[PDB]
């Protein structure tokens, strides 16, 4: 792992870099949690522009995030901080990710990580908000993203989204405006669970937002 720290921080050719990237990616699910953020950081700045969809898909299908599940939640927060540092500017990976998951909208067996990423990236990029918006409005409609995913999402992966309260709330607000009561149902379930597991500040914010939708819309 500290090899990967070093090698990530060096000037090295992309070919040896791609070799060692595969020497990592074959040994993804054979690992503890402790090591993964520094590994993944390296991987986030090991990719090309052309191996982006393939490696996101490879990664996303390969992972567990649940076998690891107080070092677990702490090192998953650091994993997500590494993700926050790589998503911010490298749009060749963020748009690659959005479109890597929208293309896996066929199978309804797409999991927590797909939605955690939706929320994080919706909070992250002001600009790519509406592609996420439209992807989710089509996604929800297919009999995909449903409650049970949201349940476990907010049941375990809450400390990450604890920070991203207003992100969730903006999504919810944008959902409840339109038709297709599936939309409205899910946006309401969002409020419920979000209010449930989060701070008293979050709760105060929620009810404020709710009475706003009431007096207004």
């Amino acid at each position: 792992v500290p090899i990967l720290d070093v090698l990530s921080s060096l000037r090295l050719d992309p070919n040896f870099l791609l070799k060692v990237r595969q020497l990592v990616m074959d040994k993804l699910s054979s690992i503890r949690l402790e090591d993964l953020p520094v590994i993944i950081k390296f991987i986030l700045h090991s990719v090309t522009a052309m191996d982006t969809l393939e490696v996101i898909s490879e990664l996303r299908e390969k992972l567990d995030l649940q076998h690891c599940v107080s070092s677990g939640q702490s090192c998953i927060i650091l994993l997500f901080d590494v993700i926050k540092s790589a998503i911010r500017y490298e749009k060749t990976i963020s748009e690659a990710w959005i479109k890597a998951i929208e293309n896996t909208a066929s199978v309804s067996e797409h999991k927590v990580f797909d939605l955690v990423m939706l929320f994080i990236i919706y909070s992250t990029n002001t600009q790519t908000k509406k592609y996420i918006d439209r992807v989710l409005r089509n996604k929800i409609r297919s009999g995909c993203i449903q409650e049970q995913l949201l349940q476990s999402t907010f049941s375990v992966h809450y400390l990450v989204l604890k920070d991203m309260c207003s992100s969730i709330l903006s999504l919810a607000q944008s959902l409840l405006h339109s038709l297709d009561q599936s939309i409205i149902s899910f946006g309401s379930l969002l409020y419920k669970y979000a209010f449930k597991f989060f701070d008293t500040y979050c709760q105060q914010e929620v009810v404020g937002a709710l009475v706003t939708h009431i007096c207004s819309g």
């Binding site: 911010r88 500017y89 990029n125 600009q127 207004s216």
Partner: protein, 314 residues
Amino acid sequence: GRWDQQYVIQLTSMFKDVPLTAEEVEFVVEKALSMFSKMNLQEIPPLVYQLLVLSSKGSRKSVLEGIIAFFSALDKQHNEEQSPSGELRHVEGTIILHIVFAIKLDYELGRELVKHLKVGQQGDSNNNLSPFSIALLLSVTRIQRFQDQVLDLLKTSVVKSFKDLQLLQGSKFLQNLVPHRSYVSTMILEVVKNSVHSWDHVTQGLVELGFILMDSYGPKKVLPSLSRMPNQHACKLGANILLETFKIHEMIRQEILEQVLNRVVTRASSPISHFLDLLSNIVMYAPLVLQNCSSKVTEAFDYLSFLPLQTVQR
């Protein structure tokens, strides 16, 4: 009958509780609005309150028409007297505040208002608006349900103003036909100039508009004339608004700057030149505020590798 100019408000309020037709509410409002001319100023807002809550069950477009005609004409009277303020703009502000708070109940008023100041066909935007109406709309903005339509209206109103002016300048025939009306850009800056009178429920809307403009109409096709030239006079108006706003309102200079730095930093995927030109202009007016954003300043310096060169340099 002729109305004892003192106690006309109470008379006006008597019509409130009687259920009337559209015709009888119309008669009272048209006459009562004709009364506005021949008065002192300061009585007008509560008059307007009673007018409005009566107008909830009748002809409301008629009242707004009369209002805006009144205040636009008198604004022009003030402008020509310039080329009588410290109370006048105050009463305006208060009136705006009344009508916002009354819309807060009844939304039909909002939609009838906006239909009145719908550009639609662009020639309506050469009789529709005044600085005063604009100030109204930017105050209205604060209602979360209305922050879309009003801003699409002002934005698209401003772009079409520039499309006209470009096309008029590049013809002589049209100049030989038309006399130049007011054009939306200069109305908006008069408003900002006159926001010193210090009703600041505007200024958040203004800020919001400036940011909208620079966000949308800024070099993205640039990384022609039609798509280029009058979607740069937009951006320039955005930035120009913000810088001018910033020189007046010492409460606001912080929040602008935090938003600007968020914009500068997170992107530089996209071209953000206009922003940095702005930032230079701001600091060159008053660098002291930048002590207050010391936090975001130092946060940028952790991101100053992942940023590209030109960003950093300027």
